[PDB]
Symmetry: C3
Subunit: 456 residues, 3 copies
């Protein structure tokens, strides 16, 4: 017997379609090559990023823990596996008691005694109704779950490494942008000083100019700090130092990511690792019901022997001192005070809990992918507008500087255009960061980067 219930994978409690509305492109339906199947070496066009990910998979201690845990759980399966087979040792026993007259063989106070090197099993449980086999398959599903948890952990690592790298690249651009800008404010301030010296620019003009310089200096210090803290974050996720002979990277203006396709909600159940994870736990919960069911049914047990017994140690390995034992022990529970029913309620409840966690994982997955698509339907429009804003801000700036130098107009307008230009450029860098990050996370949420190369 196996008393394990049949397993029916529960109904995905999400909509058949990903959402629609103003924020999303049209649903692309079924995907020839699911996003879960696209290798990260392919998804990440930047060759420098690729190597970094590689380093991280080799060296990152959290992922290393996740792989070790797969082994831990296999070892656990191997323990339960062994449990269906008899433990056989060499049991060298030896009683030597003094009894009183009213209990002795003689009738006066005697000293009886025995000895016995044997070979056999004690209390071997014979798995007729399948308590152990159930516990075993429960351990197997848990191993399988832990296998999925590793893949999950990897996809999380890939996403974090790419993000840490992109964040670095962003802040490096902010810093460089700030460098150039400070140079320009210093230049403008010097021109304005020569003008003030010569009688033309006002003290107010000069203070305004100074104001732009100092604000830019402060931002410079900030981004210098952020760039460095980004490297520290990346080195941590790598689990070792930044390699010394990287290929050249790609700038954020270039194309960094492969378009990965939406797929259908239903692909998550076959392809996202933490959903499979949760499913395995459910199947483990389900196997544990078997165990609790078997506790009702009769329970075979067995001690078995062969060896040499004697009255004194000296007669042990002497001819015809041979000994053996054979002893079955069938047991059928009849009255628990509900204990066995309660243990069975417990196991079913545990299954129900895992149904619900499995549903949850599905729901979470939907939400994250939906959000990914909300980003994908909106960031192209946003960057396009933000780029227009930079361009116009820049035209605004060119005019305002000219109108100021020429005496035609005031410093306040120049100051206004300078701020507008600098904040738009910073913001443009951030928007591009956020849009890259949304796709990275979308790739992770579809089923991510477990594969190095695309699987056909």
């Amino acid at each position: 017997c196996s008393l394990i219930p049949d397993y029916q994978r529960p109904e995905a409690p999400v909509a058949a379609a990903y959402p629609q509305g103003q924020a999303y492109g049209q649903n692309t339906g079924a995907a020839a090559v699911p996003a879960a199947d696209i290798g990260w070496r392919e998804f990440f066009r930047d060759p420098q990023l690729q190597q970094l990910i590689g380093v991280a998979l080799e060296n990152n201690r959290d992922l290393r823990v996740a792989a070790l845990n797969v082994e831990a759980f296999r070892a656990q399966y191997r323990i339960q596996r062994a449990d269906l087979f008899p433990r056989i040792g060499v049991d060298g026993s030896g009683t030597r008691q003094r009894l009183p007259g009213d209990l002795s063989t003689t009738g006066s106070p005697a000293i009886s005694s025995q000895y016995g090197v044997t070979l056999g099993t004690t209390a071997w449980e014979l798995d007729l109704f399948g308590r152990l086999r159930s516990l075993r398959d429960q351990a197997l599903e848990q191993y399988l779950a832990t296998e999925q948890a590793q893949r999950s952990a990897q996809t999380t690592l890939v996403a974090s490494v790419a993000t840490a790298y992109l964040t670095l690249k962003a802040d490096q651009a902010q810093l460089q942008l700030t460098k150039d800008t400070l140079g320009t404010y210093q230049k403008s301030f010097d021109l304005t000083q020569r003008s003030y010296d010569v009688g033309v620019a006002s003290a107010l003009d000069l203070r305004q100019a100074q104001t732009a310089v100092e604000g830019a200096r402060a931002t410079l210090a900030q981004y210098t700090r952020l760039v460095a803290q980004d490297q520290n974050a990346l080195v941590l996720l790598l689990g070792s130092g930044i390699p010394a002979n990287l290929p050249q990277g790609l700038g954020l203006d270039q194309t960094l990511l492969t378009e990965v396709p939406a797929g259908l909600p239903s692909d998550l159940l076959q392809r996202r690792p933490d959903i499979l994870e949760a499913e395995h736990q459910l199947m483990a919960a389900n196997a544990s019901i078997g165990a609790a069911r078997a506790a009702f049914f009769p329970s075979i047990s067995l001690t078995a022997n062969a060896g040499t017994m004697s009255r004194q140690l000296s007669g042990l390995f002497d001819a015809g001192s041979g000994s053996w034992l054979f002893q079955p022990s069938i047991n059928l529970p009849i009255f628990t005070a509900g204990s066995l029913r309660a243990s069975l309620d417990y196991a079913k409840i545990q299954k129900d809990i895992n149904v619900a966690q499995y549903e949850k994982a599905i729901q979470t997955a939907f939400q994250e992918v939906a959000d990914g698509l909300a980003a994908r339907g909106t960031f192209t429009e946003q960057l396009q507008a933000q780029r227009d804003l930079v361009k116009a801000s820049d035209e605004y700036y060119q005019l305002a500087d000219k109108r100021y130098r020429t005496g035609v107009d005031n410093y306040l307008t120049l100051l206004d255009a300078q701020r507008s230009l600098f904040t738009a450029q910073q913001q443009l860098i951030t928007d591009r960061l956020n849009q890259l990050t949304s796709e990275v996370n979308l790739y992770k949420a579809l089923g991510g980067g477990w594969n190095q190369q695309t699987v056909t």
Copy 2:
């Protein structure tokens, strides 16, 4: 015996009063109907929200896990409960050994053997000094704790659902506000273009105008994204789709929430579920001391029988083969190497730990409610000022546009007034969101929304 210590609920280590200072309204003292007692159907005036909460309580997988866990722990109580009663089975034994001559009945190598279908108990522990009863009441308090954890989980769910909904409603307003505003910037830009074509507005004016348009376009894309991600967040907390025939909602200008009263700090100990939770764990810790104390005291045990024994299987259900057994086993420990004292130290330490966690929960609760009241004493002033800022910003805007069109004044002033108006309106929406959120959280922290209707 029960060797469980008397339980004295520890002293609430918080101030008798909620704080005072510039940030708070006067303490309202004792509350006729404690906030914990106000049903969410009453606290939440918005009928659309009400249904959404309802959907969430039916469908949310995390709360479903919490309820299942209550059952899990009841099942656990039922196990310990059963443990004070004898396990009675049908134990069909059967030895068959070969002994040597110096051990046999004969004096030459013999094969002895027995068989015996019986009915009785093995090693039934008789609970004189109460080890089991203690373990049992420990399981009962844990069940009670888990009951409180569900209520806690519900109050967390109510708070999150209301928040997710309000956040949606806020972003919907931001989006609509942005829509209108873009329309106005487009309109202004077109007017400024006709003016430029006709010789009047300057190129600078035109660039400035353009600048407002593009910034507004970018914000539009952003809020379109946020509105959608908000729906995704709400659908997740609901644990199913947004229903298809909702009542009409209420706008954020309208009255959304019932005024809930402060109460006294002391109400938290009778009414906040995670404080009661922590208390039950403390009472469970306390019950476990009983268990460890009993390990010192003597320990009755019992095997009992009735059945049919025989020398061969064939004589089992034959007349007068009747058999029975009765066997007590009192045991008083005398020398542990401190083990039993250590086990008792452990249990007391575990109680102390739970005293401290119970105190903590109280302290956390105080802090959260205090913060709630800091919000309640300040958000009315803040919104009032922010509304004034909108009004004045709007007057500022009307004038600046007029002065610009009329040639009386420059585009920079118009641009300044346009930004001031738009950021104040956005900020006003956010402030109202934050103030609603503070009360929602305050309601949760007082003891929340476990009840559907107000309890009298």
Copy 3:
């Protein structure tokens, strides 16, 4: 025997040096007095903070849990310790069975029986190959780990208390700054009203002025809220009320912190408590290998007696009813179905897992200190620039107000200078907060504030 493997502390998988680059001061190399050794009473120059920390160490429930847990784990060690010594009780047994004729002494259905108050041990495991001693030293390392976790918890508490206090002091300054500023906007608005009444200032001027007033009012309400919520946060971390007779504090302009030295990366392995923590867990993992190894080797066991036995209860404490028992039981496993190998794989895997967690803790520590130094190499430049920005902003303001009052220039410039001044001052307060916080955290990450006074 101890079958525990030799322990080699793993190689610190971080760079020999802390990072260099634009963000960092030169590496200061080895430190005469490591930062871990500087007492918090010394590191924190503010006497009011010092007392607050003191209060927190006395009263904070989380740290109290951490200390109790050290005791819990010592108790656990004491349990395993006791396990190498024999449990000796008083075992008052007593069988009374009815057998059938074919099993009885007589040959017809008899009722045999025995009784026996004794004193001795049951199944005392004799630790030849060291299963128990291993389990014991595993419990000792776990105790040691938990000891380190307390220190860690303290250093976290010190850092949080200082931070909560600084955050309070910051917001108090923001609030005061806002108070003064509002006073100035009200003053300016009144002057502008008298000007408008008298025919000179324009309606636009007046609206602009109003705008500054209302924005300042809203900020006032906000910081009033934040100041209070900060106190609530501090009171929580203290685990009791704010004392009633504090020394006077220090303002944020003053010197608050001792310069703590970098040290070398290598100091973290001897001095950061959670790294030592992780090491102890590793040494515990390592000790558990011993246990699993011993399961292969033979296994001595022993029951021993002295007492009084009899055929009837009435003969127990009668002369020459003396009884005793002596019974060894050596056992060597021969066939497991790989179970014992699997259990040994498991224990080694568990060691490997702890190698990796130990490495991780080191890596995390490096990252946090590196970040600390990135702050230390950049915040002096940043504050210096931000201070310049305040100064210039203030000059800008003085001029703009003068040029406005005098009819020489417009309100927009005044408005611009007013915003620039107020946001720079707020920002300056925040930067100073962040820079203080970085050093506080840097001190914590080096090895923190376990010591009250500097250790020589």
